[PDB]
Design a binder for this molecule. Structure first.
Ligand SMILES: O=C(O)CNC(=O)C(=O)O
Ligand SMILES: [Mg+2]
Ligand code: NI
Ligand SMILES: [Zn+2]
Length: 331
């Protein structure tokens, strides 16, 4: 069995190996990469996502989200308070202001220590979940707006044609902006490209151990757990590395830098934070190996998780017993 300790693997494809996206995912899996839940892919030196980032300031962040925490430093939830619209140039200036800018630090480990010590005492503003792409149309390799769609994969594997579309999302971050512990919708893969700016630190639980994280979360967030049998689908709970280690939960960590891709694998729980002003692009995708995870994915039916149009068909076809209850949650 490849990668039996479930370590995060880092790949360096050549320009020739970068042509065929599906083939390279399957290669990484042949080497055991999925067992970690997360892999890093450094593009060949010949590749670029676009020519420059000099002209992005007029993108609009229609609903910036202020991330307000509650709890203790290592065990907390966050809620998202909606703020007035601002442009990417306005948000970058805000991120760089004395109130929001990254503090002085020695290295990534010192900054990580400061994040976990101090996150809860501040409310950073995240420009998350913005439909769109920064890949040039002429970039043919690993262009997250040109991937094979999840609806086409379901149709190729299972024969059933379904409605829905699959497009990328932009994330504009600042110091301390946070992504809570989650797996993807329907335990899909995700791919994330960090276009510019400061790093993103990731934490991940191997898929084979995801239920250990769920049991810890039910203990640490006991009211939330009574409210919903899949409350991590709400994407609000944070648990620090120190707390995970104290409770014996297997995990790994890695920092992504500008110019690098990360792939999350089906049922790989992940969480993390941004180091300073940045911009990432991400999208969900599927492969044949996903289908079995989709069939078994938990679902929130309490009403909180509220998701895209295109998840309807995935539930309806892969989980017909759950469909009626889940759809009530959506309505
Ligand atoms: O970058 C973020 O805020 C969150 N990203 C992801 O969870 C992902 O790419 O799967
Ligand atoms: Mg612009
Ligand atoms: Ni994710
Ligand atoms: Zn719920």
């Amino acid at each position: 069995a490849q990668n039996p300790n479930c370590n995060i693997m880092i790949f360096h494809p050549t320009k020739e190996e970068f042509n065929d996206f599906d083939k390279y995912i399957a290669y990484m899996e042949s080497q055991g990469a999925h067992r970690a839940g997360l892999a890093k892919i450094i593009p060949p030196k010949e590749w670029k996502a676009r020519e420059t980032y000099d002209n992005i300031s007029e993108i609009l962040i229609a609903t910036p989200l202020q991330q307000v925490a509650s709890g203790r430093a290592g065990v907390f939830t966050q809620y998202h308070k909606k703020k007035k619209a601002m442009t990417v140039g306005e948000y970058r200036h805000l991120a760089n202001s004395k109130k929001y800018q990254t503090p002085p630090h020695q290295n990534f480990e010192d900054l990580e220590r400061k994040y976990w010590k101090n996150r809860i005492y501040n409310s950073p503003i995240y420009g998350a979940d913005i439909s769109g792409s920064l890949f040039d149309e002429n970039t043919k390799q690993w262009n997250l707006g040109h991937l094979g769609t999840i609806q086409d994969l379901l149709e190729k594997e299972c024969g059933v044609v379904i409605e829905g579309v699959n497009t990328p999302y932009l994330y504009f971050g600042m110091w301390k902006t946070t992504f809570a512990w989650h797996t993807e919708d329907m335990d899909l893969y995700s791919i994330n490209y960090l276009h510019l700016g400061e790093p993103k630190t990731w934490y991940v639980v191997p898929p084979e151990h995801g239920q250990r994280l769920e049991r810890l979360a039910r203990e640490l967030f006991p009211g939330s757990s009574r409210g919903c049998g899949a409350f991590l689908r709400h994407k609000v709970a944070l648990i620090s590395p120190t707390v995970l280690k104290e409770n014996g939960i297997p995990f790994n960590r890695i920092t992504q830098e500008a110019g690098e891709f990360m792939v999350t694998f089906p049922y790989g729980y992940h969480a993390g934070f941004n180091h300073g002003f940045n911009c990432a692009e991400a999208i969900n995708f599927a492969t044949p190996r996903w289908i079995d995870y989709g069939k078994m994915a938990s679902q929130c039916s309490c009403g909180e998780a509220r998701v895209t149009f295109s998840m309807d068909a995935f539930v309806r076809i892969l989980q017909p017993e759950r469909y009626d209850l889940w759809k009530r949650g959506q309505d």
